[PDB]
Amino acid sequence: ALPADEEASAFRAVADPTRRQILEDLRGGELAAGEIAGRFPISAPSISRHLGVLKGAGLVTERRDANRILYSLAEERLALCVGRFLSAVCPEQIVLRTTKWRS
């Protein structure tokens, strides 16, 4: 779990347009694997592989509930792993804010 390993696996995960779309779909709340597979014109096993890549990179969490795997966005992990680089290269356009604190 070394943070350049975590950056690298996060960048490989968001390299793929299907995986980006799965992450956007999860921003509204937890979705079952079957619901995610229902939204894409590729095979269920191809969606399983995409979801395994996202889970491998810490970008989604998994939970079981009967015969169903439900996926949740891990937005804090994504923000740190991609957002440190992006705010480092684009300091005048992109701000990372992990802090709970607000004005």
Place this chain on the structure above:
Amino acid sequence: RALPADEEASAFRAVADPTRRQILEDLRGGELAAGEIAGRFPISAPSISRHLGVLKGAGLVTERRDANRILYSLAEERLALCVGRFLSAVCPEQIVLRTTK
């Protein structure tokens, strides 16, 4: 040039690679010659040209001829929107995009 969705896709395939992210980070300090970029990595000159051509094709660097030498500049506005719209959409609480001052 391309639709925003295609500029987004090409930026994400460019920043997929750790050598390309390191090049973009190195360019943060100002324009560098191809040869200087190549000297910052233990990989072949043809491999650095290939990485630079991928960054150029995604609009994340711009190229300039000064006599016989190619110089590269970071295109930070392009990178910020192509990657930052998605990242601020998925992480609204943690990531703020401002294209403007």
